[PDB]
Amino acid sequence: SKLPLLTENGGRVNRVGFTRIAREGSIHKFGFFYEFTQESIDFDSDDGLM
Amino acid sequence: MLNYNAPTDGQKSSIDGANSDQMQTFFWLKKAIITARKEQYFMPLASVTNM
16 A cells, blocks of 8 residues: 555655664762771781781 | 770670681790799708718
């Protein structure tokens, strides 16, 4: 039913069009930390704890 | 915070869990304290006779 047929005369028939799409993405931030003291290092029985 | 606390007297360190504890808690000189002999006075007086 929807084939693009022509006739011998021609004319302004069978016009078409186009389209485009866009995509996106984003970034985020993370982090964490820890704490200690000097006596925790100096008096601990295991060196190389850090 | 990670604290040493006092492993002796029953307050475990923060790093140690329920199963663990500190291994070294004191330092040992390894040089003992000794007492010398008592001096003798009557002994040098004597002379010896063989038998």
